[PDB]
Swiss-Prot record, chain A:
It comes from Homo sapiens (Human). Keywords: Acetylation, Amyotrophic lateral sclerosis, ATP-binding, Autophagy, Charcot-Marie-Tooth disease, Cytoplasm, Disease variant, DNA damage, DNA repair, Endoplasmic reticulum, Hydrolase, Isopeptide bond, Lipid-binding, Methylation, Neurodegeneration, Neuropathy, Nucleotide-binding, Nucleus, Phosphoprotein, Transport, Ubl conjugation, Ubl conjugation pathway. Its EC number is 3.6.4.6. Phosphorylated by tyrosine kinases in response to T-cell antigen receptor activation. Phosphorylated in mitotic cells. Changing I349T: In IBMPFD1; uncertain significance. It catalyses: ATP + H2O = ADP + phosphate + H(+). The gene is VCP. It holds the Pfam family AAA_lid_3. The lineage of its organism: Eukaryota, Metazoa, Chordata, Craniata, Vertebrata. This is Transitional endoplasmic reticulum ATPase. The PIM (PUB-interaction motif) motif mediates interaction with the PUB domain of RNF31. Residues 688-707 are annotated as: Disordered. Belongs to the AAA ATPase family. Changing R66A: Strongly increased affinity for ATP. Strongly reduced affinity for ADP. The modification N6,N6,N6-trimethyllysine is found at K295.
Length: 755, 126
């Protein structure tokens, strides 16, 4: 019906004054890339930017950065007017003034440090009365455009002088400072923030709708996870982006108050939040205000918990107050808090992933002049076990180390050192290495739920196994309707069996990666720990985690560890039943409605596995992972040696074919030994050359020789001299024996219905 | 949806229905963003909560009482079990006859036994 066609959305690419549009429609907007585009927002304001095309952008909405969005005063999910304007006018002595309370970050000259590096060749169209953010000197300064020779807007070009003021001026209060938290500042969690945004949009973004429709929106959300995961960040960003009035109920803030009037503070906070519609009440450290009852005989603790319960149940559906809470784990707060209507929905922020850690690194490293040597990927990979707060601390430590090495060495320090000198220093990769050496998590214990990054390329061959895994996992999700049509319920359970080191864990990770489903790996040591400690109730917690991360692929690697611990094959006097496997069976039987979670088991000793594991509703689909073939061996060798620099002269196919029955582990060991031999030779040769050369100063030429720059053939012969066959033919005999026993009997091959 | 909602309670079902309604309102309706203090009813009448919404809600249900033991009148009938005529007859005797005709059991001074034990090969439908 002739819509506006312009919507507000988050920006994926790092850029200011740039707006992305959906690639499918260029004639509708009638503008392709690289053209000034005007945009009308609200309250009689407009902005000018440059338009590009993004394949990921949805046609319905137009991705845009937070700076431009603040300029328009629009918010995420809003609808505004767009107007393709090929016309654009240059400017003369474009004027800029310091704005807001941002001050003391610059000394002496204040225009060469920030404006010049950014407006040089940027061609960013500047309009009267807009604020644009400049990043530099480990700082962010927003500059207002108050004066300009042409009106109302002009595209900046490298031919217009800049008028210098250097006098900061307070910005209008109704305007929102861009230093406040937002969606961009909150990374590493991805799709939990989407769930919270969907959860909170209608109650806050469209409040009047719920007054004309009778339905209850979510008024209680429990953000729970390890400390430092950004739960407070999520709450603040949701409050700011939706415009809701954010109120912070600090856990120990009320609890430090004298008994009998701290309840007064809680009630006053609830009343104040109710007074201003819509609002968000964030109870930080909720496990301190309303913790586990009876295991709390204080006396006033019970009163405070009851007051909190009355307040939560006292929400009269008036206003649009959303009560969000922060807790380390759902099991730490009083269960009565988790009832319906109080906190009926929980989001597990959890530790970030490798990509999450990387993104957190970019958010925390953006004003510091990250060095050119660093790329932030190696640090992210090595930062396993850290949380977003840990990454921020690591970045701050790296910045401080850089400031200590350079800069402060001279000791030319004053009340506010000149910015540009700090711009001169870049945080080098050595600083990041030192910070990683001084990181010390801090959340290394927590279980990791990640979308595995291994792909089918990493796993060589296994075409039949790969196809069945695709069938079982991908087909039900991709075509649920067709599974419903034939009245067949897809089985939820696989069991990989085969010789050790054949890549069952990698196969499970690859199948999880293809479906883009989180992967939870329960190794043998964890099951053995639950067995020795006689704590098998943690299996229930594991399954709950799988439920929270659904869709997920719960993989139980080396599931036969407990059977081996009880005696191996002969075992004890008892049967195959054990506590941990029994709990797993109970959970698997009850874990049928979820549909998302997929259970994969791996075992190198299928004979000793409990038969109840294989009953219907359990890991019915047994898959034999045999030793890699010649093509599989070639693929495994190529995958192992991809990172290492291998000379083209070495014929890897010959090595793969010569390895008659080596497992994947054996091939990896051979590759590692070859790399070690190459490294030892390089270190010894370079060192012995340097030792001789250092005797005479400058003696030999300055020629930059690389004695060994790639793994040579001789290194591969050196490696093969120690080649070992991990898997004996007798236990392969046992695997084929179990596969035969599992075979569908005999005599029914020729079965045919009568014609 | 009812069959797939095993483990939920009445409140859970209400929450699922509310979530489906909100998802339907989000897909259509609020996409245009033509919202006021009280949007016109009939447009909301135009939108019907589609089965895709219910599927999504079930995907976002998360019981909430899945642990509790279930006491249900089983919906399987004798048709589902093939043959077993003799076994079916004795089960009818032992269970149904005492309840249907307590007076006749009282007349002969016999107290019906309360306990059966099915034994046989696995998977035969006990
Ligand atoms: C159609 C259907 C899909 C389904 O799945 C949906 C699903 N989502 N994520 C997953 S898994 C996760 C995805 C990320 C990685 C792994 N799944 C799933 C479930 C089971 C097996 N494989 C996948 C379940 C069960 C059914 C149905 C089949 C028959 C009948 S009736 C009338 O008795 O005949 C009723 C219902
Ligand atoms: C007449 C009688 C009925 C009875 O049952 C009643 C009953 N209601 N629900 C059930 S079971 C349930 C129904 C839903 C499914 C299953 N029952 C029941 C009890 C025992 C065996 N089968 C059924 C018990 C015992 C007696 C009596 C028999 C002999 C004597 S005297 C003088 O020593 O000779 C005294 C008392
Ligand atoms: N996922 C994340 N993305 C970006 N910054 C994060 C993230 N997690 C933590 N941080 C940083 O660590 C700080 C502390 O985390 P915070 O959320 O305030 O504590 P809590 O998790 O207990 O609520 C935050 O102020 C933020 O700067």
């Amino acid at each position: 019906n002739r819509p506006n066609r312009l919507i507000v959305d988050e920006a994926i690419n790092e850029d200011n004054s740039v707006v992305s549009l959906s690639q499918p429609k260029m004639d509708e907007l009638q503008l392709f890339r690289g053209d000034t585009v005007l945009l009308k927002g609200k309250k009689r304001r407009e902005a000018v930017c440059i338009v590009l095309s993004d394949d990921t952008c949805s046609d319905e909405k137009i991705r845009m950065n937070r700076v431009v969005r603040n300029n328009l005063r629009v918010r995420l999910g809003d609808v505004i007017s767009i107007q393709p304007c090929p016309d654009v006018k240059y400017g003369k002595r474009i004027h800029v003034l310091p704005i807001d309370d941002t001050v003391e970050g610059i000394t002496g000259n204040l225009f060469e440090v920030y404006l010049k590096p950014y407006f040089l060749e940027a061609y960013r169209p500047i309009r009267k009365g807009d604020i644009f953010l400049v990043r530099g000197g480990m700082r962010a300064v927003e500059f207002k455009v108050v004066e300009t020779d042409p009106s109302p807007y002009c595209i900046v070009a490298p031919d217009t002088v800049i008028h210098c003021e250097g006098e900061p001026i307070k910005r209008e209060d109704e305007e929102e400072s861009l230093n406040e938290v937002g969606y961009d500042d909150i990374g590493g969690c991805r799709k939990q923030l989407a769930q919270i945004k969907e959860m909170v949009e209608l109650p806050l973004r469209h409040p009047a709708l719920f007054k004309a429709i009778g339905v209850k929106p979510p008024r209680g959300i429990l953000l729970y996870g390890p400390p430092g995961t950004g739960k407070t960040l999520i709450a603040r960003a949701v409050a700011n982006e939706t415009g809701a009035f954010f109120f912070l109920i600090n856990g120990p803030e009320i609890m430090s108050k004298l008994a009998g009037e701290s309840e007064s503070n809680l009630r006053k906070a609830f009343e104040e939040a109710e007074k201003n519609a819509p609002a968000i009440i964030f109870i930080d450290e909720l496990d301190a205000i309303a913790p586990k009852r009876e295991k709390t005989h204080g006396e006033v603790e019970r009163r405070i918990v009851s007051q909190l319960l009355t307040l939560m149940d006292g929400l009269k559906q008036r206003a649009h107050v959303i009560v969000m809470a922060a807790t380390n784990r759902p099991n730490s707060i009083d269960p009565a808090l988790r009832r319906f209507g109080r906190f009926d929905r929980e989001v597990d922020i959890g530790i970030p992933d490798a990509t999450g850690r990387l993104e957190i690194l970019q958010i925390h490293t953006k004003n510091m002049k990250l060095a050119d040597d660093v790329d932030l990927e190696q640090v992210a990979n090595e930062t396993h076990g850290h949380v977003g707060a840990d990454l921020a601390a690591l970045c701050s430590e790296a910045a401080l180390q850089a400031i200590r090495k350079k800069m402060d060495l001279i000791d030319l320090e004053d009340e506010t050192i000149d910015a540009e000198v700090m711009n001169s220093l870049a945080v080098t990769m050595d600083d990041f290495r030192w910070a990683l050496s001084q990181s010390n998590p801090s959340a290394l214990r927590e279980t990791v739920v990640e979308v595995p990054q291994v792909t089918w390329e990493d796993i060589g061959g296994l075409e039949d196994v790969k196809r069945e895994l695709q069938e079982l996992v991908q087909y039900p999700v991709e075509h649920p309707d067709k599974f419903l049509k034939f009245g067949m319920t897809p089985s939820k359970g696989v069991l990989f069996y085969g010789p050790p080191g054949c890549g069952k864990t990698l196969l499970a990770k690859a199948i999880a990666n293809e479906c883009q489903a989180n992967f939870i790996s329960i190794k043998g040591p964890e099951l053995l720990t639950m067995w020795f400690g006689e704590s098998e109730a943690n299996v229930r917690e594991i399954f709950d985690k799988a439920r929270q991360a659904a869709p997920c692929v719960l993989f139980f690697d080396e599931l036969d560890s407990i059977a081996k611990a009880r005696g191996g094959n002969i075992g004890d006097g008892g049967g195959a039943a054990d506590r941990v496997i029994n709990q797993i069976l109970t959970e698997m039987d009850g874990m049928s409605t979820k549909k998302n979670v997929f259970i994969i088991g791996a075992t190198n000793r299928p004979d000793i596995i409990d038969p109840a594991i294989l009953r219907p509703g359990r890991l019915d689909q047994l898959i034999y992972i045999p030793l890699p073939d010649e093509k599989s061996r070639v693929a495994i060798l190529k995958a192992n040696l991809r990172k290492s620099p291998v000379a083209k002269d070495v014929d890897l196919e010959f090595l793969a074919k010569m390895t008659n029955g080596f497992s994947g582990a054996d091939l990896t060991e051979i590759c590692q030994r070859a790399c070690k031999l190459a490294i030892r030779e390089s270190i010894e040769s370079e060192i012995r050359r340097e030792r001789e050369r250092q005797t005479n100063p400058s003696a030999m030429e300055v020629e930059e020789d690389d004695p060994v720059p790639e793994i040579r053939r001789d290194h591969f012969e050196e490696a093969m001299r120690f080649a070992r066959r991990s898997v004996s033919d007798n236990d392969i005999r046992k695997y084929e024996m179990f596969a035969q026993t599992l075979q569908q009997s005999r005599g029914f091959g020729s079965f045919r219905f009568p014609s």
